[PDB]
Write a protein that binds this ligand. Sequence first.
Ligand SMILES: *[C@@H]1O[C@H](CO)[C@@H](O[C@@H]2O[C@H](CO)[C@@H](O)[C@H](O)[C@H]2NC(C)=O)[C@H](O)[C@H]1NC(C)=O
Ligand SMILES: *[C@@H]1O[C@H](CO)[C@@H](O[C@@H]2O[C@H](CO)[C@@H](O)[C@H](O)[C@H]2NC(C)=O)[C@H](O)[C@H]1NC(C)=O
Ligand code: UDP
Ligand code: UDP
Ligand code: NAG
Ligand code: NAG
Ligand code: AKG
Ligand code: AKG
Ligand code: FE2
Ligand code: FE2
Ligand code: FE2
Ligand code: FE2
Ligand code: MN
Ligand code: MN
Lengths: 700, 700
Amino acid sequence: PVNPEKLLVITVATAETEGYLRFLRSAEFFNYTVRTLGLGEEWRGGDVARTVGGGQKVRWLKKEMEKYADREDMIIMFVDSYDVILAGSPTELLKKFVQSGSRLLFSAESFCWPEWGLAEQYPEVGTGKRFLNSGGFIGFATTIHQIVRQWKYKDDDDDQLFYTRLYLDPGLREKLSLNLDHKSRIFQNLNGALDEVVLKFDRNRVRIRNVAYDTLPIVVHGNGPTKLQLNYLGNYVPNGWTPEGGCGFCNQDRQPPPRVFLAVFVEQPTPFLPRFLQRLLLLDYPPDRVTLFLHNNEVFHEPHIADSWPQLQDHFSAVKLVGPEEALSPGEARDMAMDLCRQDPECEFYFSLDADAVLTNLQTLRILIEENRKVIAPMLSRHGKLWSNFWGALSPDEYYARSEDYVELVQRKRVGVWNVPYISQAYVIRGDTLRMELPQRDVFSGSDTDPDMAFCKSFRDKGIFLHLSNQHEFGRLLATSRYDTEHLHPDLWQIFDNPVDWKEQYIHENYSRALEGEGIVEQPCPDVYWFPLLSEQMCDELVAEMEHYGQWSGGRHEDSRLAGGYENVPTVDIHMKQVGYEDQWLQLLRTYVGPMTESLFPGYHTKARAVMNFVVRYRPDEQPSLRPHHDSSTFTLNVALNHKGLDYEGGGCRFLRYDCVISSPRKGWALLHPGRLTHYHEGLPTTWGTRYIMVSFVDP
Amino acid sequence: PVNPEKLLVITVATAETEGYLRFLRSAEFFNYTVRTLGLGEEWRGGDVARTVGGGQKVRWLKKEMEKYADREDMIIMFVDSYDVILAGSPTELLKKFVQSGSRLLFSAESFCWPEWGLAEQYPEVGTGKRFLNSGGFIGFATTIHQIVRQWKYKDDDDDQLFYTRLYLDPGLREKLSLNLDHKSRIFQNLNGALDEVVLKFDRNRVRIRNVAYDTLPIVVHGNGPTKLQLNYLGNYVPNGWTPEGGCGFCNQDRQPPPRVFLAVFVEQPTPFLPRFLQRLLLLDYPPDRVTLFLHNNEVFHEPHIADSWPQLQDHFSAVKLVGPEEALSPGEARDMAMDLCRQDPECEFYFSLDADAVLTNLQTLRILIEENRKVIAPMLSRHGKLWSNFWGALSPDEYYARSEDYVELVQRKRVGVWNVPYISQAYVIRGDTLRMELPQRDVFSGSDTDPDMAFCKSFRDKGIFLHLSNQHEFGRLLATSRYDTEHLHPDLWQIFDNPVDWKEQYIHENYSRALEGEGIVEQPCPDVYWFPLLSEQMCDELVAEMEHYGQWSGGRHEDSRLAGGYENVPTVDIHMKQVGYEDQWLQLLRTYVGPMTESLFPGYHTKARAVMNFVVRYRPDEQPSLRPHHDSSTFTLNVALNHKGLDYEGGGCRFLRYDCVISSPRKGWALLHPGRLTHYHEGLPTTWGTRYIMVSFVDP
Ligand SMILES: *[C@@H]1O[C@H](CO)[C@@H](O[C@@H]2O[C@H](CO)[C@@H](O)[C@H](O)[C@H]2NC(C)=O)[C@H](O)[C@H]1NC(C)=O
Ligand SMILES: *[C@@H]1O[C@H](CO)[C@@H](O[C@@H]2O[C@H](CO)[C@@H](O)[C@H](O)[C@H]2NC(C)=O)[C@H](O)[C@H]1NC(C)=O
Ligand SMILES: O=c1ccn([C@@H]2O[C@H](COP(=O)(O)OP(=O)(O)O)[C@@H](O)[C@H]2O)c(=O)[nH]1
Ligand SMILES: O=c1ccn([C@@H]2O[C@H](COP(=O)(O)OP(=O)(O)O)[C@@H](O)[C@H]2O)c(=O)[nH]1
Ligand SMILES: *[C@@H]1O[C@H](CO)[C@@H](O)[C@H](O)[C@H]1NC(C)=O
Ligand SMILES: *[C@@H]1O[C@H](CO)[C@@H](O)[C@H](O)[C@H]1NC(C)=O
Ligand SMILES: O=C(O)CCC(=O)C(=O)O
Ligand SMILES: O=C(O)CCC(=O)C(=O)O
Ligand SMILES: [Fe+2]
Ligand SMILES: [Fe+2]
Ligand SMILES: [Fe+2]
Ligand SMILES: [Fe+2]
Ligand SMILES: [Mn+2]
Ligand SMILES: [Mn+2]
């Protein structure tokens, strides 16, 4: 049993990047001892992510190995650090190295790189990997020194070609007992073997298994174009996220805060923008520490921005607007806003927030700053669907692809802070990162690629992690796909696409409490029920949309009312069908009115059928009253739409068989009464002003 | 101006018949002085209604004229008496006779009788009547004596041939100044001139006018086959019935009563016979003075007669039944019953009453006896129609014909006691008339003619008047045309044909009072109404007719009830359609339920549509309850059909949204409640016995 105190891990790292720090954490998890070579220096090995190189690694190792040229008691493993994580303990590692009977064991891979012609010189292996990979090897210090001391080449010569040529010396291979880890018992190189690797979970740690050879590798190496796949595994292996401990590096359970540049982007017509702009005043972060930047590309939203701008300017430390007259593309506007923070040393954090992002968590900015990341996004999902503001994987064309764990994250089965290839709509970026690591201005722009994709590729090309937190509930994403803007109030028609936000804006606030009972619903007359349904904004926008139509009812117009032996009781009204709002109003009936009817009349069942839906106008100049009648309905919904006293003087509804009068209707509230046989009723005259009501004859 | 005290009316009458007494009354109305010849004697003039004769009249007149052979101061008018009425005063008569310039003026007529060949010997008259009629003439006593003293012929020689031959003597006609009343200024003979005579009304007397000559005759002579036409005129002229005085000989405004033989006839299956038989015990006449005779020709009514016979035998002085086993024809049974009274001197009055005669006036027998007629019928009419128990006129074939005043009598515009050619269904006949004037037994029988027609012709052939009184409301006639007898209770199906009687037997007695208000209708639960609808006989016969069908509901049977989200709430029941009683029950809904619904729910209008009508049976052995549900109806009718406690133990109806229970239903009463949305309700379990209810889902 080889003593673990005789094991030394040597790696190269010219800067303490997020990958290197990820490698170190995995090493400290198993109590390895690591020696890092080249931390202060500048990288002369060339563009290794692009071509061959890395000879500077060998040179540094050869110098380090001269202290250990005679230490037969020492085992030494060399690994890369930016694209490597450790999955197993030193004890299992040393036991597996002894089992190989080798004195210097290299990793094996599927490709003969860089010189593909040398493939013939390699020994034949039946089913394992055949060729050498210099990203990882382990052996005796004496044997390693005999190999690395033969280095005498340029800092930008290929390290792997150097090791490959020595291995392909049959006499030297036999003499020094050199071997390749063909079946990935120790080293797992991901390139060319992505379908062979799966996660293997445990209670408080995670590993990978090679399903082609049924092994449990110690070293995972995201070599070549497998950096993102390793970023995926790195979220779990070894203690990233575990079934019993949750995530391992997130905050989990939670004097002046840092100054922040808040950048808002309105690049398409977006619903409920006034509601968003009012939410900016509610974010729980000292506004004297926040600088607001708002790019509006839509002339449809200029009235919205203008209404809010006095409140915003009075709220934040400083504000700035770049409207549609500047003709900035989305990529030019995002480059400008981020570059405003980059060129301001007082900008410690840059917060980008898009128009379709609803932040239900008012502590989002704080939560994300405490995570102490370079780039981090909060998880936002389109309500009740899988689409969200991030990607878990990329296609070979670097377009969208679903990851093996995407659904578990969106559904918050596994919660934590995740390293993902793509984020959008809302993120917080360290200002220091913009100055020192992403100093160019062409972040979102420069190419034909989409601005939000160029932004993510810009950070990945620098090895910056894009973090995503579902540790908390942060909010949702609005559907903006087919926003119909040709209305006086286009957000009225948003009951199908954004029903959660439509309810918060238009349904009465105390509706839901009334639906659960507890003494809100009233019964002012026998079998007539009274409950809050619509909000004052819903009433005002519905009335206004009616007047904007203008074509009210006149003579020869017929309603489905019953008086005497004839259906000749009309009203001055507009039907939902005429204004194109019938389907929308029927949806309100199914969702909110129907369930209220089944609660108040136990035993009755409704699907909220209604062919007669219309708004009535009562005025002394034209028709101020409505004579007694029955409704062609099983039950009738009667909703006031304005204020008694402020907007009109006069009475409401009278039920004759009871001599009961609804003398003072309430604006948002609705009346529920049967339409046939028993509740013969009358519309008292409007003496001053104008009286608007909404009425549906449901279940005819 | 000739003195009326010099006028003498001479007529012949061997018996004080009703025609002679009718003539005398018209004469006493104008204060004539009448001398009647031959009152004690027997008629030897032959069958004058059949052939020629009347010479006995001339012989009696010739003897009477010998006292006045020299009285030039005396005017004498001779008229028949059985078929003559006087329409004018003696003053107008004498003035018109003087205007003629004649010394003996005969009546004129259209036919040359008896010898038609003598028509050539008559003088030519342009437009008036050409030939002589011996039924009436007026002239000086001296001139009349010179004519009548030439009589020397047989008592059965023709009187008119005698006068005709003397008139056709041109020398004698010129000598004595003989003339014929060509244009009916004085004498109106009806035969051959029926279209020339109309009634002319006045305030307190009536006349006739000749519209061919525009005259107002004094003497109306129903000569030949015009006796019935004169009977018609005799109802008015001269003071029979007047617009201001009403009738002139009727009773108008009303110690042992005479003994009566009451004869009941059941010659066809007749509805509501048990109700008739119970009414016999209610007639307001001392039953110890009435002898009952009942002929039943129908085996269908033997159970009905048997149920009533103990009460009848205990009620009347003596009873007798002649059932279907005797095989008596209707004519043989009516001959027998009348002949039982004829051969009993203690029978003072004979009362014939048929099965289809409903006597609503319990004093009918008294009223008709006080009229002191030989034969008199009360007027009975089929409800709401013109058909009644009498004819006002005859066809030339002596079949039915409508009289000029028939409708005014049936509608009781003119009320009185009328001399009509035909009566039926109910009449009272003096027993003395049967013994002395109609002694034969073949009254209804003897020929192929209908028994009721033979009966009337038998009395007309003897000059007996058939009187009809509409002075009071007496009753009605049942429709018996298409009585469907193939039912356990055929009177249930009588709602269309006899609706007045159907209501009195089957509709609850206090229904109508409840329909007018005054605190009968109850509201035991909110918007549930409770009122009496059916009578106990209706409930018992409806239940019995259901069990007699027997095929109650079982599994797989579906009703139009709503529970949860399914219409799977069944009952053990029978639908009206299965038993052929749907049309009948729908008529009850239209007539009695509908009007009650519009009264209780003001503003609602109904035509009582109902596709679901059925009787439910609740039993502990099979289905004793009904789970909560709604009705596929605008409102529901729920009528109990038996007694709580006597017939079943258990609850009734529970309305859940109100926690209101109809725990003790009343048998005949009905519940009225809405079927949808508000009155979710439950049928409490029947713990003992059997619970029957009738239910309709009206206005679905
Ligand atoms: C919803 O219900 C709340 C509480 O039931 C209402 O709040 C009250 O509003 C009135 C005036 O609008 C105040 O006088 C009370 O003091 C409020 N009560 C509380 C506890 O704050 C609220 O108004 C209702 N919403 C609407 C739209 O009427
Ligand atoms: C119709 O109404 C009358 C009176 O409202 C009812 O007559 C009463 O009947 C009860 C018992 O049935 C007696 O105790 C009362 O003395 C009666 N009152 C009078 C004034 O006679 C009659 O019962 C009702 N008809 C039915 C079928 O119930
Ligand atoms: O600027 C650099 C680039 C390279 N490296 C080290 O050189 C190794 C080789 O780089 P890389 O893993 O990207 O090459 P690959 O394994 O994909 O061939 C990295 O792991 C780092 O440890 C470094 O320290 N600084
Ligand atoms: O039994 C009789 C039949 C006849 N008459 C008288 O004779 C008249 C002639 O009879 P009738 O009127 O019937 O004959 P007609 O006028 O029709 O030819 C009657 O009016 C009676 O006054 C009579 O007194 N007793
Ligand atoms: C690592 O070493 C520490 C002592 O330095 C020890 O407490 C801990 O249990 C070790 N962990 C593992 C996984 O060996
Ligand atoms: C008939 O005579 C009486 C007197 O005897 C007289 O009172 C009456 O008015 C007379 N009637 C007529 C109609 O002449
Ligand atoms: O004016 C009212 O409140 C009654 C209106 C009404 O009943 C109807 O429009 O059907
Ligand atoms: O048993 C009852 O009274 C209720 C019967 C009922 O509701 C029905 O038959 O529809
Ligand atoms: Fe309308
Ligand atoms: Fe209405
Ligand atoms: Fe049924
Ligand atoms: Fe029911
Ligand atoms: Mn590497
Ligand atoms: Mn005559």
